[PDB]
Amino acid sequence: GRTLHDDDSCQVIPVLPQVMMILIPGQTLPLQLFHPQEVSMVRNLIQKDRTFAVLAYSNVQEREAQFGTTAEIYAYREEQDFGIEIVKVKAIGRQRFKVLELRTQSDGIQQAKVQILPECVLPSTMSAVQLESLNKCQIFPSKPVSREDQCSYKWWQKYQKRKFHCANLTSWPRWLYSLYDAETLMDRIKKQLREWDENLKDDSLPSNPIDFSYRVAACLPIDDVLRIQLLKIGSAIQRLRCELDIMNKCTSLCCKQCQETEITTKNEIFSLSLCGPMAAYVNPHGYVHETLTVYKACNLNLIGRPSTEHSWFPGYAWTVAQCKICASHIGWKFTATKKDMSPQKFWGLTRSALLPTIPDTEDEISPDKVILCL
């Protein structure tokens, strides 16, 4: 079934030592166990509550953690892979908690006294001024269930005026209440995720904002130390707000493959022709590339000599460019042939090889701390 503790209660539950990655509630965790004490300890959990702790480490090398997530096992199977006899276990994140004590046992397995942090659920912001006669005008005549009719901000505009009609009884306008409204915040995200990657919004994302906020915290392209901030937030509203602030702070692009190398920033983008900054170009072998033009990029190595052969930008010669770290292909460096060419050198990055990320300040000369918003 489902084993769940009460809010704000102290619980003492074991921590698996091999685990280190942050577990967001809702997302699934598969594990591979070889050690007998790990297996024996998991076997005992199947008899009892089936729940263990997955910490959110701030420094995994020192094993420093202030919060984490409980994990409920739901799948157990003693498999064999590569001539090794291993147990494969699947668990799911459930409750959040605040780390209190980290007593380590006689085994390598260590116990953890911890206090369950509750999921803070707030009623409608306008519910606070009593559900009176304008209440019957609060509910909507269904949704348009149309991708094109519900993108109509004409619908989202009628949504705001009607949901927050009572805004004039308070000291703040309707549009401020929209900035704290989950459905609005959710759709603000969806519109920006679809901007990053085209995909079906209906199937891929859950409709519940608590499920939505957590699901997005998992798939956001961010460091797990930054992800700890999202794990602390108890209100799906503040969580959705924070994720929007992050999304707006992801102004740079890194290697999609290694994700350790900041290539370029959005500032460096530019439209070479009226075609746009990004366009789809073809090579002489039938390969199609969505190419982004940027003035400056770094942490790249060049391959081969420049060639004008089948150049997408006449007057420029391309040189294949790849990531400094993993050598996956990132694009091309375009260099002008003549002196009267306007930028003289620029870069053509293929989109599928890039991934947006927050500009890191690995230069410790000016490391101003990133402040997330609620």
């Binding site: 090579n283 002489p284 072998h285 390969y287 391959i303 081969g304 000599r305 060639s307 391309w318 294949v320 790849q322 993993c326 050598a327 996956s328 292909h329 091309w332």
Partner: peptide
């Protein structure tokens, strides 16, 4: 050093065959 081993995907030139094979595998 005339690099007659070309990748049809990105265009990289290579000077021996087996080096290009290492390359086209990273594309996947």
């Amino acid at each position: 050093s005339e690099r007659p081993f070309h990748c049809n995907q990105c265009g990289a030139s290579f000077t021996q065959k087996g080096n290009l094979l290492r390359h086209i595998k990273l594309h996947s």
